């Protein structure tokens, strides 16, 4: 289910997911000087059922209620204490990410700039957004 590759990097652009599909993983990374808790989870996994989706196997290195999402997708997980500044996500087949040029850069490409993970020829591959930011 996981896509081996990360979504395409477009120079002078960034991407972000609208919501995370069930199966999405996020590494339990910690900040400099802080280590991952003993026998703890190495990854958080987005899971779900007929009533809700949520993140299982919580990371460990503020708000007491961590709300579940509607079924099929998870929301951006809340920050955990002493977490690394960069988030390492691993997406599954069917996941879409959306692009925007960085402020000060513009696109000639008309319409939506998106990338989807597809299972093509027995292997996973992200579609190429036809996007150039100048």
């Amino acid at each position: 289910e996981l896509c081996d590759d990360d979504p395409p990097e477009i120079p002078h652009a960034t991407f972000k997911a609208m919501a995370y599909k069930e199966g999405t993983m996020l590494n339990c990374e910690c900040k400099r000087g802080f280590r991952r808790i003993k026998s703890g989870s190495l990854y958080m996994l987005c899971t779900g059922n007929s009533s809700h989706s949520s993140w299982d196997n919580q990371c460990q290195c503020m708000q007491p209620v961590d709300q579940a999402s509607l079924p099929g997708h998870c929301r951006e997980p809340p920050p955990w204490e002493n977490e690394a500044t960069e988030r390492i996500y691993h997406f599954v087949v069917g996941q879409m990410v959306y692009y925007q040029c960085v402020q000060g850069y513009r696109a000639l490409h008309r319409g939506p700039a998106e990338s989807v993970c597809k299972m093509t020829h027995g292997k996973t591959r992200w579609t190429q957004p036809q996007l150039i930011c100048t």
Partner: antibody
Amino acid sequence: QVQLVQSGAEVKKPGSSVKVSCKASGGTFSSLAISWVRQAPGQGLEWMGGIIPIFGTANYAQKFQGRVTITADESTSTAYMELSSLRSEDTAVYYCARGGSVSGTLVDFDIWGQGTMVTVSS
Amino acid sequence: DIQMTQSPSTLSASVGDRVTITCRASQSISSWLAWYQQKPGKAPKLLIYKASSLESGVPSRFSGSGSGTEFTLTISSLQPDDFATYYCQQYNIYPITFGGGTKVEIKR
């Protein structure tokens, strides 16, 4: 293909707030900017601001003096424009419009909503 | 703010005529200029973006030209659907600003 459907006409007293909605019909918002432009009766077009859905980044015209708030609900593909401390000069047709490219909020507007007449009067 | 000045404010023309509408910016806007058509009671419609790129579905009788501070919209051989108001828009810098409009009306 993608269309923008706005909420119905509003009649408001001065000093109140109005919240107009702009819903995508026959598609989704994507990361294309959703912006708001108004036109006072018999006048030209005036930009109010825009938001980038998903990213959440919003820009506003300073002349509104913080009276405009623009938000987007990605799950229902609906954008909102809230204008506070309404005055008679805010009487206008308010339009929402989608950006032509993923170039933030400094874009041409390729798809427009039908417009929402807002009348501010005592 | 960048002030966009359109001229003429109004013009009278017949079906078959060529019309040229001008948009001048108070400062350079590179080529970040778009042209719209608007009929009474309706939303504006995008015709041209980036000063000269024709929008998908818009007839080829519409063409835009210009850079910096001077831009034109030309309609070659005007048709009944073209009597409307036209507006230019700059999107070089914030705030986004529009020209005052040019009404194209039927000569009789």
